[PDB]
């Protein structure tokens, strides 16, 4: 008698995984982003689906039963109880118990779910690209209903800490200014990691990406950004998390706000470059700090600039605007295409090639070979 | 084997000491159907008793490590409870036995049975 073992034993359906775990669709999709499980296709799906021929998603039983002992599943159901205690409080007009329970809103911990799925920190370094990219993704858009306004500050703090620690360790090696934005390819603790960052533009809601699924996926990426910061700052001797200057944050100093206090990397180190209010100086200062160069900026570009527009210490006062009426002597106005090529070629690129009012060359991919 | 110096080594060291003590006994019953000396039937006796010492030892290194595990706990399993008598486990405790109202607390701090005497 078939229908007891073979493929149909280890392989089981999506609906059956709802029956054997006692969850719903929105409950099942909620947890398998934090915990890594993806559908697995049999080599023969008719035998595995107990003779039927419908198109049906399939799962190992060794992971769907490994899901049973997870105490985070208890936190979700004990989040169901809370809102049916808060609505009991809010629905009976008692405002004060409605305030007293939201502070003790039950929150699970993301410690033991990052323990088992990423064993090695180097393996965690290998899978830190998409999480950091997502950390750099939602950190510049407006506040969304399903997205967390407080988590937006976490997205701002985690990416800056990733920017400050990499700049302190000079981990960034390759950088390309592609059509999408500035793709930064770094290498920390041996693992070479590439992260793509877009330009700060007037974005709009796409009305098609599930922000509910995004808020869950961002929460899975919020732990890895901090845990790596807990590891990288300990590796570099800095504070995890580093002390952040709110006054410099209110003045938009970037990595200068998050003070990294201790608890060819010199391609442009001998070049104190300044900037006007014509380009994305946030990544420009990150590229300069990763390459050892002193980064200046205009007051409109942001406060905390070590070098001003009138400062004669500007080695290469790069201006994205081709018309630089205040181009100082010794601060020749160049374009970011030369600096991007300088980050690509690893040497001091020709500022006369990609100058302000000069032809920018074709920027190839730094990761390409 | 002297049971006081069995407890001076960890649990796993009692572990590999367990089977070859059996493999001696497992081999020693083969000689009974083979036929041998009479002093090994004394060795039959003292290998079972030596089997029956380490098993006493290892079991008391599990339960005594469980008791240190279940300190301070409101609930402990059944096998570590009292086994006195069913009528003793399910009867009142002297706390609840000696619980009084507030009325019989007042009536025995202003009016207790004092000690007195007479004179014959």
């Amino acid at each position: 008698q078939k229908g007891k073992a073979g493929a149909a034993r280890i392989y089981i359906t999506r609906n059956q995984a709802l029956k054997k775990l006692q969850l719903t669709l929105a409950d099942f999709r909620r947890i398998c982003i934090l915990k890594g499980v993806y559908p697995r296709e049999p080599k023969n799906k008719k035998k595995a689906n107990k003779g039927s021929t419908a198109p049906v998603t399939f799962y190992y039983t060794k992971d769907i039963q490994y899901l049973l002992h997870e105490p985070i599943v208890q936190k979700f159901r004990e989040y169901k109880v809370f809102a049916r205690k808060l609505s009991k409080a809010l629905g009976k007009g008692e405002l004060e118990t409605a305030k007293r329970l939201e502070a003790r809103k039950p929150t699970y911990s993301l410690d033991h779910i990052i323990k088992e799925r990423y064993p090695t920190f180097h393996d965690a370094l290998k899978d830190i690209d998409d999480a950091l990219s997502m950390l750099f993704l939602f950190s510049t858009m407006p506040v969304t209903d399903k997205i967390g306004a407080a988590t937006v500050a976490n997205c701002e703090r985690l990416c800056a800490e990733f920017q400050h620690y990499v700049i302190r360790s000079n981990s960034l090696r390759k950088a390309f200014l592609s059509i999408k934005g500035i793709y930064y390819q770094a290498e920390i603790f041996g693992e070479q990691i590439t992260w793509i960052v877009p330009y700060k533009f007037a974005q709009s809601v796409p009305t098609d990406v599930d922000f509910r699924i995004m808020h869950t996926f961002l929460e899975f990426y919020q732990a890895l950004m901090g845990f790596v910061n807990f590891k990288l700052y300990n590796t570099l001797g800095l504070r995890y998390p580093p002390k952040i200057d709110v006054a410099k944050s209110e003045s938009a100093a970037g990595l200068a706000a998050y003070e990294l206090e201790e608890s060819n990397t010199s391609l442009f180190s001998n070049f104190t470059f300044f900037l006007s209010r014509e380009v994305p100086r946030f990544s420009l200062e990150f590229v300069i700090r990763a390459f050892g160069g002193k980064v200046g900026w205009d007051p409109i570009l942001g406060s905390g600039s070590p070098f001003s527009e009138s400062d004669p210490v500007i080695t290469h006062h790069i201006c994205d605007r081709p018309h630089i009426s205040q181009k100082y002597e010794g601060r020749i106005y160049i374009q970011p295409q030369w600096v991007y090529d300088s980050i690509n070629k690893g040497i001091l690129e020709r500022t006369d090639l990609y100058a302000c009012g000069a032809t920018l060359p074709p920027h190839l991919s730094p990761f390409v070979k | 084997l002297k049971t006081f110096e069995l407890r001076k080594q960890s649990q796993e060291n009692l572990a590999e000491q367990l089977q070859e003590l059996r493999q001696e006994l497992a081999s020693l019953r083969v000689q009974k159907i083979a036929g041998g000396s009479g002093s090994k039937l004394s060795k039959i006796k003292t290998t079972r008793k030596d089997i029956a010492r380490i098993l006493t030892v290892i079991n008391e290194s599990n339960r005594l490590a469980a008791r240190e595990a279940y300190k301070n706990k409101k609930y402990i399993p059944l096998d570590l409870r009292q086994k006195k008598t069913r009528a003793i486990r399910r009867a009142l405790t002297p706390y609840e036995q000696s619980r009084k109202t507030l009325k019989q607390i007042k009536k025995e701090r202003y009016f207790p049975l004092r000690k007195y005497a007479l004179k014959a």
């Binding site: 009976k92 007009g93 008692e94 004060e96 118990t97 007293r100 | -």
Partner: protein, 186 residues
């Protein structure tokens, strides 16, 4: 149908098809929607303090005493609505209550069946409102049976003299013959 639902619609209808005595007949004619939204608006100032935040003011009262300060000498007599069946029967017999509120769904109906007769005799203006649980929400309870205002402060006395006049004029002034005839048998 399940084993219990076919009872749950039938005891709904046997209260209708039978002869309701005039004592019980008044327990279905009930204060309306409108005038039962201002009574609970006046009461929602005089709720009893929630047991969690009575303690909150008690730790703030007992911390200054542990230093030497006090507030018992300047503590004015408190206010709230008065609830509980046995405390409100004695608040009517002593002519202390001024507005008695009777739930319309007390399960053993004998618990409140003497109250519209006691309120008629002692001269305490009364009304029968819906949903015992609605009273329960007022006083932080699951199911209340009755409430009573016995003393509002000088702030709402002028409001209370008006809202009672809505209670007599709609419940007591009306409903005067349906309480004097049998009900049910529909």
């Amino acid at each position: 149908w399940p084993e219990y639902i076919r009872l749950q619609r039938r005891r709904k209808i046997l209260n209708l098809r039978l002869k309701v005595p005039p004592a019980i007949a008044q327990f279905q004619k009930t204060l309306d929607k409108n005038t039962a939204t201002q009574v609970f608006k006046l009461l929602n100032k005089y709720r009893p303090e929630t047991a969690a935040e009575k303690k909150q003011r008690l730790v703030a009262e007992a911390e200054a005493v542990a230093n030497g300060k006090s507030a018992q000498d300047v503590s004015k007599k408190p206010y709230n609505v008065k609830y509980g069946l046995n405390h409100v029967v004695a608040l009517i017999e002593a002519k202390k209550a001024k507005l008695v509120l009777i739930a319309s769904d007390v399960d053993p109906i004998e618990l409140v069946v003497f109250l519209p007769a006691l309120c008629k005799k002692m001269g305490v203006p009364y009304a029968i409102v819906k949903n015992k649980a609605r009273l329960g929400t007022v006083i932080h309870q699951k199911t209340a049976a009755v409430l009573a205002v016995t003393e509002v402060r000088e702030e709402d006395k002028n409001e209370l003299a008006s809202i009672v006049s809505a209670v007599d004029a709609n419940f007591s002034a009306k409903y005067d013959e349906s309480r004097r005839k049998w009900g049910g048998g529909i």
